[PDB]
Amino acid sequence: MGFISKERERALLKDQQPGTFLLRFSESSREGAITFTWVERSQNGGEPDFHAVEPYTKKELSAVTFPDIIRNYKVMAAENIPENPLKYLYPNIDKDHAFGKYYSRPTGYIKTELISVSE
Amino acid sequence: MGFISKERERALLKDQQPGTFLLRFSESSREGAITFTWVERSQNGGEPDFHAVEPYTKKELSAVTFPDIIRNYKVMAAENIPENPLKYLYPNIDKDHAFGKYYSRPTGYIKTELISVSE
Structure with missing residues (x-):
């Protein structure tokens, strides 16, 4: 969707499963950064404070593609799965399904x- | 340690805590790649098959520093800490301690x- 205001975004996420996510461009970049x-x-008994991520410039994307960021997003803790x-x-x-086709790939080094991981 | 043979490495890791690691430069890149x-x-009741990781070249190191790889190396599973x-x-x-001093650093974006992560 790229361009959407951080107002009519919240008010378009009062949709569904606690686990829907937009694609945005960031407005506060000078390098132009997706998020x-x-x-x-x-x-x-309502909406969340919602959640967004520090926006991904070329730097990061040079080193791993956007899709593959997403696939393997975590969020973590000390000692919790x-x-x-x-x-x-x-x-x-x-x-x-959306981003299926874009994934890369699927004595001996490991x-x-x-x-990309939060917290 | 940089330069060492993958013979007198193993035979110098029958030291200590299941949890010691050298640094090596890889012999098998042309791009020059540390590991x-x-x-x-x-x-x-003995030595392990030991472990070493796919070698970390410029590409990767461009994106996040080698030390910082170290700090936060993982290895993972499906549903295990x-x-x-x-x-x-x-x-x-x-x-x-060794690599303390190089670490970088230690509505509202997250x-x-x-x-770097294996398995």
Whole structure:
């Protein structure tokens, strides 16, 4: 969607599964930086404070593609299994369908790949 | 340690805590690419198959610094807390000492990092 105001975004995420997420451009870049936004359940019986991510410039994207960021988003803790709070894109589309086709790929060194993680 | 043969490496890692690691430069790139090597306990009452990682070249290091790879190395699973097999550098030196001093740093956007991860 790229361009949308951080007002009519919230008011378009009072949709669905605590786990829908926009694609936005950031307005506060000078390098032009893409981002996403997603939504939870807060227990108060309503909308979340919602959630967005520090926007991904070329720097990061040089080193790993946008899709692949998403696939493997975490969020973490000290000693808790890590979440993946990304299920459905805009209306209802399973992550691993929209961006399926863009994923890269799927005595002996051990295989690493990069990963963006919060907290 | 840079330069060493993958013979007198193993035979100098029958030192210590299942959790020591050198630094090595890789012999098998042309691009020049550093790597690390570390050791476990296999339960058989001896040395591990040991472990070393796919070599980290410029590309990767462009994006996030080598030290910072170290700090936050993972290894993961489906639904298991993620480990940190790097504790002691060569003879006995706590990770968070050797490479302390190079670490970078320690409605409202949420802070992301990059991180290197296996499995």
